[PDB]
Amino acid sequence: PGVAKSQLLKAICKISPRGVYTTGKGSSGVGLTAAVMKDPVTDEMILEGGALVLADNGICCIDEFDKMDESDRTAIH
DNA sequence: GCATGCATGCGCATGCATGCATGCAGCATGCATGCATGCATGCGCATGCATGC
Ligand SMILES: Nc1ncnc2c1ncn2[C@@H]1O[C@H](COP(=O)(O)OP(=O)(O)O)[C@@H](O)[C@H]1O
Ligand SMILES: [Mg+2]
């Protein structure tokens, strides 16, 4: 504890053009991969992207890696 | 003086601008049904955790 790892993650997420900062249990399930929603404007079925889909061609920053679910860890794998 | 003919008022029918109610119909408004739509309910099922042994 207290060696400034999280500050480094915050900094590296501020320097990258595309980069997302997420914490262990606050981003679980469809908040990582994708979700099914209906588009209000075009009346079509879309897929909403999660953190991993927002950081495509970028850097993803995950904090408290040890606390995540097994399902979330499979996706990272 | 006397005989005559025209203008003026009296008497009689008729038409006609106002005005208003009633029965019938034409006419538009409000109502009943019927349905499309998207949201929220509540309900069993699978997963991840906290507890006991
Ligand atoms: N080497 C360091 N240099 C500067 N600040 C540090 C250093 N180590 C820790 N800190 C400070 O101490 C705190 C550590 O918080 P954090 O980044 O969450 O540490 P950790 O990731 O280990 O939990 C922050 O305020 C950070 O600025
Ligand atoms: Mg930390």
Curated annotation (Swiss-Prot):
Residues of the full protein shown: 462 to 538 of 845
Biological role stated in the UniProt entry: Acts as a component of the MCM2-7 complex (MCM complex) which is the putative replicative helicase essential for 'once per cell cycle' DNA replication initiation and elongation in eukaryotic cells. Core component of CDC45-MCM-GINS (CMG) helicase, the molecular machine that unwinds template DNA during replication, and around which the replisome is built.
Amino-acid positions noted as binding ATP 1 in the UniProt annotation, renumbered to this chain: G2, A4, K5, S6
UniProt organism field: Saccharomyces cerevisiae (strain ATCC 204508 / S288c) (Baker's yeast)
Annotated family: Belongs to the MCM family.
Protein name: DNA replication licensing factor MCM7
Locations listed in the record: Cytoplasm; Nucleus
Coiled coil: none
Miscellaneous comment text of the record: Present with 166 molecules/cell in log phase SD medium. Early fractionation of eukaryotic MCM proteins yielded a variety of dimeric, trimeric and tetrameric complexes with unclear biological significance. Specifically a MCM467 subcomplex is shown to have in vitro helicase activity which is inhibited by the MCM2 subunit. The MCM2-7 hexamer is the proposed physiological active complex.
Subunit relationships: Component of the MCM2-7 complex. The complex forms a toroidal hexameric ring with the proposed subunit order MCM2-MCM6-MCM4-MCM7-MCM3-MCM5; loaded onto DNA, forms a head-head double hexamer. Interacts with CSM1 and MCM10.
